[PDB]
């Protein structure tokens, strides 16, 4: 699983341990070992959501499987919850793109997962 | 709609208001209310296009629908036009990836659009 | 072809010429003229792979065609090889997403490739 977060929130506002919490919560949520989970936080971005510069986030979750209608719906609750509580970003100023990656299309350790 | 721009152009060369102009032009171009449009500009990047370090840009437009052969062709005119005029990037040093997102795959405000 | 690399490795650790080597190796590997190859390196990122902050990388290769089971497998060898040798990132701390882009979905120079 790979979670990326781009946000206008300053680096200083990213709580220590945020990456750890995301790895842990996403591991539970997807049912994958934490060791397979990679997380990326990109703060201080030049962004606008709806033409406003208020705190917002553009994210994406890539996963070989574990992506689907109902699952994505609960990932959004989990993720928006985390972003709201930890980064103080309003849930309606967050977009999360979900990608069900094919194993043959995910390279890792000199090969792919196919 | 979500528009991202990665470019080697310095932050100082990004005109104030560029994010607003993008929001407005993309809203018109896609026929979506400006409030649904999110824009992201990432300057000062370590990039190379064709092996050259001259100003270039790697972009992506994600949209639930409003993506297609003809539409994408005019988006490129609009976007390359804006990048050329506002960031002085030559149109032939710009790649834009278009993504027709499924509503069930776009999370927002604790749920998805499905 | 478009190759992006996000890594926690410091900017100072990115060897001069790395972008050039990537452009050249990817050109050979995909069988495309170097002029069509765009490369992007994003260092100093706040990342975690498996909950660890040791050097890691999250990458993606987008290409109109030239994407497939066997090809992706050798791209991973090539790419992990380069990342390991030039950025000292362990191959098992690298994820590379492969995207076979439809020509109608790749904008360039005021139009698309369709």
From Swiss-Prot, chains A, B, C:
Organism domain of life: Eukaryota
Broad enzyme group: isomerase
Main location: secreted
Catalytically driven reaction(s): 3-phenylpyruvate = enol-phenylpyruvate; L-dopachrome = 5,6-dihydroxyindole-2-carboxylate
Active site, per annotation: 1
EC number: 5.3.2.1, 5.3.3.12
Gene3D superfamilies in the cross-refs: Macrophage Migration Inhibitory Factor (3.30.429.10)
GO BP of this protein: carboxylic acid metabolic process; cell surface receptor signaling pathway; cellular senescence; DNA damage response, signal transduction by p53 class mediator; inflammatory response; innate immune response; negative regulation of apoptotic process; negative regulation of cell migration
An example Gene Ontology CC term for this record: cell surface
List of residues binding substrate: 32, 64, 97
Positions of modified residues (N6-acetyllysine): 77
Keyword field: Acetylation, Cytokine, Cytoplasm, Immunity, Inflammatory response, Innate immunity, Isomerase, Secreted
Subunit record text: Homotrimer. Interacts with CXCR2 extracellular domain. Interacts with the CD74 extracellular domain, USO1, COPS5 and BNIPL.
Disease note: Rheumatoid arthritis systemic juvenile: An inflammatory articular disorder with systemic onset beginning before the age of 16. It represents a subgroup of juvenile arthritis associated with severe extraarticular features and occasionally fatal complications. During active phases of the disorder, patients display a typical daily spiking fever, an evanescent macular rash, lymphadenopathy, hepatosplenomegaly, serositis, myalgia and arthritis.
Protein family per UniProt: Belongs to the MIF family.
UniProt cross-references to PANTHER family, sorted A to Z: D-DOPACHROME DECARBOXYLASE (PTHR11954), MACROPHAGE MIGRATION INHIBITORY FACTOR (PTHR11954:SF6)
Record's miscellaneous remark: Serum levels of MIF are elevated in patients with severe sepsis or septic shock. High levels of MIF are correlated with low survival. Drugs that inhibit tautomerase activity protect against death due to sepsis.
Name of the molecule in the record: Macrophage migration inhibitory factor
Organism from which the protein derives: Homo sapiens
């Amino acid at each position: 699983g790979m979670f990326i977060v781009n946000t206008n929130v300053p680096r200083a506002s990213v709580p220590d341990g945020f990456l750890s919490e995301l790895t842990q919560q996403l591991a539970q949520a997807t049912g994958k070992p934490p060791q397979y989970i990679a997380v990326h936080v990109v703060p201080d971005q030049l962004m606008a959501f709806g033409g406003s510069s208020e705190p917002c986030a553009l994210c994406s979750l890539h996963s070989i499987g574990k992506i689907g209608g109902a699952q994505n719906r609960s990932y959004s609750k989990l993720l928006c919850g985390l972003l709201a509580e930890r980064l103080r970003i309003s849930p309606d100023r967050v977009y999360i793109n979900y990608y069900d990656m094919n194993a043959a299309n995910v390279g890792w350790n000199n090969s792919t997962f196919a």
